[PDB]
Symmetry: none
Subunit: 76 residues, 6 copies
């Protein structure tokens, strides 16, 4: 028997920004201390892991906009 699919999403959408002067931003961390103890680690399949981080980030994009899409079609 006939099976028909039509998949045809239409997207004219926009993510957009205007900004004046972007600046005069100060990030000044006063150190820190970290300890971790373990005997065994055992990581299998898809794993994201951070152990003992002390991480400083300054992130100042003039836009910084995101558009994210998943399109999935599954047939069985």
């Amino acid at each position: 028997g006939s099976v028909q699919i039509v998949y045809k999403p239409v997207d004219l959408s926009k993510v957009t920004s205007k900004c004046g002067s972007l600046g005069n931003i100060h990030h000044k961390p006063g150190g820190g201390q970290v300890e971790v103890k373990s005997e065994k680690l055992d990581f299998k399949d898809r794993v994201q892991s951070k152990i003992g981080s002390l991480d400083n980030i300054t992130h100042v994009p003039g836009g910084g906009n995101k558009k994210i899409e998943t399109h999935k079609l599954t047939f069985r």
Copy 2:
């Protein structure tokens, strides 16, 4: 017997911003202290993990807008 699907979402949407001067931003952490103890870690399949973080972020996008879409069709 005939099966017909049509999938055709229409999207003219907008995510938008206007801003003046963006600035005079100060991020100033006074340190800190962290400890973790374990005997074993045992991570299988999809895992996201942070152990013992001390992390500072300054994030100042001129837009920073987000649009996130899942389009899914599953057929059995």
Copy 3:
């Protein structure tokens, strides 16, 4: 018997902002202390985990708008 589906949502919506000068923002954390003790950690299937974090965030988007969309169609 014939089975027909049509999926056709229409979206002309807008998420929008206007702002003057965005600024004079101060974030000044006075340190802190964290400890965790464990014998075993044992993480299977989809897991998100933070253990012993001491994390400081300053987040100042000029727009910061979010639009999140699920379109899901399932057939058996």
Copy 4:
């Protein structure tokens, strides 16, 4: 007229201690925050001053005894 003074205190005193194992001491301060505002500071003659301190002390003497004496004679 003849003036005679004699000053002759005798001191055989003892300040004394005995102790077993001195230990298993933990001092773990959880940070803190301090602010001071002033227009003028104006210090004359003998002054001791602390402004805006955030100071942590661990003090574990095996003895820690103190003996303090003023001997004064004043004549006119």
Copy 5:
């Protein structure tokens, strides 16, 4: 007329200690934050001053005993 002074304090005193094992001492400060503002400072004669300190001390003497004496004679 004759003035006679004799000053002859006698001191056989003892400040003393015994201790077992001194140890297993942990000092772990979780950071902190300090601010001070002033326009003018104006310090004359004998002055001791700390402004804006953030100071950590661990002090573990095996004795740590103190004996302090002033002997003063003043004649006019």
Copy 6:
């Protein structure tokens, strides 16, 4: 007119200690942050001053005893 002074303080005193094993001492500070503002400083004569310290000290003497004597004679 005769003035006679005799000053002859006798001191057989002792400051003393005994201790077992001295050790297993941990000092681990998690950073910190300091700010000071001033326009003018005008320090004259015997000023001691610390501005903006962030000082860590570990001090573990096997004795650490102190004996302090001022002997003073003033004649006018």
